[PDB]
Design a protein around this ligand. Structure first.
Ligand SMILES: Cc1ncc(COP(=O)(O)O)c(CN[C@H]2[C@H](O)[C@H](O)[C@@H](OP(=O)(O)OP(=O)(O)OC[C@H]3O[C@@H](n4cnc5c(=O)[nH]c(N)nc54)[C@H](O)[C@@H]3O)O[C@@H]2C)c1O
Ligand SMILES: Cc1ncc(COP(=O)(O)O)c(CN[C@H]2[C@H](O)[C@H](O)[C@@H](OP(=O)(O)OP(=O)(O)OC[C@H]3O[C@@H](n4cnc5c(=O)[nH]c(N)nc54)[C@H](O)[C@@H]3O)O[C@@H]2C)c1O
Lengths: 366, 364
């Protein structure tokens, strides 16, 4: 069996976790937290990193700290994982869906301007599959409208864009450390920012809105979105070998790049923009429109051959919760939801492994 | 330490099993095993593990249909999450006073607060003591209201032969580091209602349709517990009686020495409706005293003795001051004079004494 993603706990994870257990610091109180944060902040080259329980709560906490609320509009790509839009909804705000680029799958900056209104407060570029959005044109449209930018970098730890790491481009950014992620904590998330004020607000809200100086004295309504010492310990040990893990994944992409040619025009290989490092959290192809099969059957057929795969997201506006947000200008997102396929991408796959997926695809793409 | 975890069971092993098999996220068999074991322990049909006690309250309320325009009765005297959870739904907390001895929701003050908007009542079992449920459940029945127990601090408590978590339409617990059963951070919802449980599971899991990769029929949350968390909780639950017994010992100790103290403090009232687990041993400091409750904490600390104030009621703090009424006097009185003394399984009778050295050397 070839799994689509899998962690590679080949560092201090086990030992750092035993330290947690042995010292009994297993809750959201512990040394690993601030250490994983600091190390994470260094890695992104930002001033602050705020560890959360998951990528979804990281998004929600960031938005609320940014002051997003009822009446506000936040521009979000329709093609993304639902938490991007849900996080806006939790705030009482309205997601304003935008189309993406047919090759990078990312928010198409040329389509932003027209979506801007008196209620717009922020734009949420989402760096799908490990590739960062074309940030230059996005920030200049934002700057021109005095809008905030929050990167949804859930799937992009380690990616770079014109010398800056994902996480250091927008006013703030969030990451996920779910089990299939480049860096995992089992479940976990992180917000990054260089804004002191924003960081304090996030921390205050993350820790139940409690006055740090007054036990049980709460100036505002907050949340319980803290990460545990155990999650942080695993995260620390993972980031410790982030380069190694990134290398392994690049090793895999190369095989894909080297052997995909075998399928000819049957798939479109992921386009890599030349702006910085694409970390390939997943290697995603667009199946040729010529095939007779459907993307879903291919998924079935690969599974039947003992090969895991995932569909590129169903766009927000085609699903029940956000169908009310549909517009006539979300066509690339739909096209992409129909023909995209994430292929197995993880540090444990072997050349052979790849050969197997390629052979399976050669076989199933018809 | 006012509280501390007691990891003297299979926690480490169960955790190394998640590391060793690599199931460390919110997929692992420990999650369902812990839920099953916990449900059985509570004597209920379903248990839904969550990432903490606060999200467990939120999830429960949302799954109960609580929303904008609804009202939920909540004691002013409680941990803030009880009220915030209602706020998250866009609902309005309607504060009620508590009993001066048990610190729990005063059932006699309930019917007066019911309105056309009331959809539920949230009795909070503070300090390991279950509210006086009978009346609470009748008033609710009478008004067709739902009851959600915030049982965060009361795992193992019993009321008339029934365990906390099995009395209302649903209930929630917290497994924070200082709890009777801990998972580091973690929570659970219990219920006998199949519909409710299904809805809670759907929402807990990002609203995803379990049979369609990335197909979501509703807006959910990411409120899942990790396999590692459930592994720790399964292990702790395994030794629940053992941990409860240890607390009982510490308790018998306080009880038997509090006396030296006479009346500069008031010992915790224990209702005889079932077992009081004493997540914390809480006294109300004596009226006459020249010092202040926070000075006692302060002093207590300098002496290297950790303690916590009984909660400041919601209505006196900024987020909920607009909900103040003139009939939350007991809450305020308790917030003023209440004190939780270190209460945990790793404390010694010596520990106690010394706690007491200071309590005598400090109640002025
Ligand atoms: C743009 C964006 N924004 C925000 C978010 C939200 O972040 P978060 O999920 O709240 O942290 C996300 C989150 N995206 C992830 C989510 O975290 C989500 O959970 C995930 O859905 P999934 O594909 O259905 O996840 P899965 O089927 O549970 O796990 C995928 C593979 O990873 C493996 N795996 C997961 N956990 C483990 C583990 O602990 N151990 C091992 N060995 N394998 C694991 C599974 O066995 C599968 O092979 O994939 C999504 C694309 C995002 O993409
Ligand atoms: C009625 C009610 N409803 C809902 C909730 C919310 O549930 P949750 O917190 O969302 O799970 C709660 C939550 N109550 C707890 C909260 O979970 C909470 O965080 C806690 O606040 P705190 O007093 O400020 O907690 P602390 O100072 O961080 O920890 C207290 C002691 O426990 C220790 N401790 C915590 N975690 C660990 C650990 O992992 N290991 C060790 N050795 N000690 C630990 C600390 O060092 C302290 O000595 O006390 C509150 C009463 C509740 O009471």
């Amino acid at each position: 069996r070839i799994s689509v993603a899998a962690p590679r706990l080949d560092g201090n994870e086990r030992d750092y976790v035993l330290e947690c257990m042995d010292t009994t610091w297993i809750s959201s109180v512990g040394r690993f937290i601030v250490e994983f944060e600091k190390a994470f902040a260094d890695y992104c080259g930002v001033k602050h990193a705020i560890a959360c329980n998951n990528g979804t709560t990281a998004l929600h906490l960031a938005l609320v700290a940014m002051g997003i609320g009822p009446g506000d509009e936040v521009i979000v790509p329709s093609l993304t994982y639902i938490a991007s839009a849900n996080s806006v909804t939790y705030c009482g705000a309205t997601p304003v869906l935008v189309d993406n680029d047919p090759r990078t799958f990312n928010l198409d900056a040329a389509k932003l301007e027209a979506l801007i209104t008196p209620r717009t407060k922020a734009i949420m570029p989402v760096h799908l599959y490990g590739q960062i959005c074309d940030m230059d044109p996005i920030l200049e449209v934002a700057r021109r409208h005095n809008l905030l930018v929050i990167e949804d970098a859930a799937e992009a730890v380690g990616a770079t864009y014109r010398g800056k790491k994902s996480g250091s481009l927008g006013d703030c950014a969030t990451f996920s450390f779910f089990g299939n992620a480049i860096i995992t904590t089992g479940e976990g998330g992180m917000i990054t920012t260089n804004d002191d004020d924003l960081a304090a607000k996030m921390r205050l809200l993350r820790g139940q809105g409690m006055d740090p100086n007054r036990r049980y004295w709460f100036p505002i309504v907050g949340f319980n979105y803290r990460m545990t010492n155990i999650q942080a310990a695993i995260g620390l040990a993972q980031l410790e070998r982030v380069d190694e893990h990134l290398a392994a994944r690049e090793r895999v992409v190369g095989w894909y790049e080297q052997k995909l040619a075998r399928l000819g025009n049957r798939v479109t290989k992921p386009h890599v923009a030349l702006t910085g490092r694409h970390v390939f959290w997943m290697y995603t192809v667009r199946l040729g429109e010529g095939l007779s099969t459907t993307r879903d059957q291919v998924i079935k057929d690969l599974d039947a051959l003992g090969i895991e795969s995932r569909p590129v997201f169903h766009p927000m506006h085609i699903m029940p919760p956000y169908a009310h947000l549909a517009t006539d200008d979300l066509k690339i997102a739909e096209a992409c939801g129909v023909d995209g396929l994430n292929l197995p991408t993880h540090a444990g796959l072997t050349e052979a492994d790849i050969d197997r997926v390629i052979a399976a695809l050669d076989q199933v793409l018809v």
